[PDB]
Ligand binder design. Structure first.
Ligand SMILES: [Zn+2]
Ligand SMILES: [Zn+2]
Ligand SMILES: [Zn+2]
Ligand SMILES: [Zn+2]
Lengths: 214, 214, 214, 214
């Protein structure tokens, strides 16, 4: 699967749509504004279009390593602010995935070079929930960290100035934390949904105690 | 399409796939290492997987507003480092797209807030090629800027410590600059493909100088 | 004191010192690399040279709001990698200060604009130590947070790939965590001094537990 | 010097000041907002206090390697936004210095590791002003680069959203670009002083033009 193969597939796929479904390229030319912002991992095990049955132009996307929303990452923060203040999306979905190489490397902590600084933020979370994790069986720990990561990133995004001041002026925006597994591509909703300052907090706290129950 | 319709489509898609033709989840479980890193725009007008016929898991993906590789952006540089040092991808494709809202905002320069700062890196490019751009009919400057911007991020990518150090140690990594439009989804190779320090410079230079003809 | 006056203070002072102490500049013209790196706050309540009696060129300096060492801030990590890998400093001091405007604004959390995102890193610490902080009076929480901040930034610095690879190639580098008051200018060693991976973890746990005693 | 010798230097100084220059902690007790924000290099060869005679509490300070203001460095833009919006400083001075190790490395491009990424922002400037620099004696090129660096950082600072929305809402803020050398400590004004976006641009254009005639 060389590069010249990608060029040639694209050419066959485009040449077939031009003549056979003129549809497509008009839907895109409709240039309709996105309504969701997907914040996912660069592993991109199962593309978000495939996972949700969303069409091109309906998803705004950011992908870094391990779905993080770092308080001071201007790259991710810039995606969010464009999305919210300019594109006026209504839904921001942060979605992790069980078996994430990033999450796993955060715990095993191999010497991988520069990436380990990025992965320190996920380690912060593993130690933050030491007790919660030490109480559940050794074999369900990684998956749970993957879930906590996503809860924490939802927490962070809600505390961003972008989101706090978007809610405060009345604009409708809803954050969601999800995860999918690769055994079945099924999206599990983590029930940490937020539409203002209050739910954000409630749902996050509820989210941590719901985990303490195992 | 609102949030209840995405949770439903996914359960239909999943389970529907598993019961009639399940050998897909098998192949994913093997978690084979991706060979391409795709750095694209958050707009994602046409997803990379649909452009190229790359399957799930065949590509690492980063997306930010206007597919930028900023010298000092630890987000994109972490993706790139992980992909190169740890996953050992052979190809990095930076793909821009004609009509990008980022690229347009960069030139029109409306008051958008936080995002404008990120966009200054594109504005830098606009003024860098003010002569080239000025000797060209007004109506072509946006599409030209779009290519110029990809050419510059590729150039940026190969100058990073990560790429300089992969090439020097003999690792095989090739960097590409592409762009597509929405009228036909057809990929154009902007022809700045680089496999070492030397071709990086020569390709960049001819990339610019062959625009100055056209 | 407007600009006109800073230029004249500087002119007078330069003229004066060229007539009456040319050695001042003879000392500075030398290949003498700094021995210490100072990470302090942009408040710069009492400068570092006057706290310690350190002289021109004996220290490398970084200052940001609340003297943070964020896992993924390339600004501060660039200053560190340069100091350690290139200038080969032997001591890194992170110094906070009681009354720090940055810390105070973290807790009181006014709507200050863009800076609030920077400060969420301190709020993380305010909530990490929610119990210890919660069981003291309101007035004393600000000074404890200040020392807690300094301890947590030493921790982060110790965990950074730069310190990690430095310590394991057997380079001599000591991290310190200090704080000064503005009733004295007296430097309290917060007693988290780290020479290696091992002392780093010990001293950090020592630090937090010894605070929780009082 | 030694770490014990920094603590006792300090201890000594803290009594020989508490009632011998008694009006030091009298001044700082009044936690008065600085009027100046100084953005300088981590080299800090001659401190800003000693150069200008500015007293403790009168300046806010940011230092990074080679005194940069990157469009998307949140560390430096955070200091700036807090300085301007919260502290309401009237003056921001970016000061570079001749013989800056950061500028020199940018040109000569040794492999120093992580810092090279940061210095690529200076390499861009080196190349941006290729003709200017080539039309001068080679011996003069590093000094001119150091100055062009300050000018370009000033340009960046004035184009950030923090500065644009401060000048649009009538707040009085003046940006200046200075440099000094170690041979006499004498500040040199590079004359890019701007109080709004219109003079920012004019001042930059003539900054570059007057170098060309010289
Ligand atoms: Zn992942
Ligand atoms: Zn775009
Ligand atoms: Zn402070
Ligand atoms: Zn310097």
């Amino acid at each position: 699967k060389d590069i010249d193969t990608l060029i040639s597939n694209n050419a066959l796929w485009s040449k077939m749509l031009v003549e056979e479904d003129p549809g497509f390229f008009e839907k895109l030319a409709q240039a309709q504004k996105p309504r969701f912002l997907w914040i996912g991992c660069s592993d991109s095990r199962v593309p978000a279009e495939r996972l949700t049955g969303l069409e091109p132009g309906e998803l705004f996307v950011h992908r870094n390593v391990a779905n993080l929303v770092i308080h001071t990452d201007l790259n991710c923060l810039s995606v969010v602010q464009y999305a919210v203040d300019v594109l006026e999306v209504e839904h921001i979905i942060i979605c992790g995935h069980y078996g994430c190489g990033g999450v796993q490397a955060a715990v095993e902590n191999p010497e991988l070079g520069l990436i380990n600084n990025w992965l320190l933020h996920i380690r912060d979370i593993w130690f933050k929930h030491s007790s919660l994790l030490g109480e559940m069986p050794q074999e369900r720990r990684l998956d749970t960290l993957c879930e906590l990561n996503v809860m924490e990133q939802v927490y962070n995004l809600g505390h961003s100035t972008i989101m706090q001041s978007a809610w405060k002026r009345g604009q409708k925006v809803t954050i969601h934390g999800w995860a999918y597994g690769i055994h079945d591509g099924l999206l599990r909703d983590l029930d940490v949904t937020a539409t203002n300052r209050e739910t954000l907090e409630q749902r996050y706290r509820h989210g941590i105690s719901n985990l303490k129950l195992k």
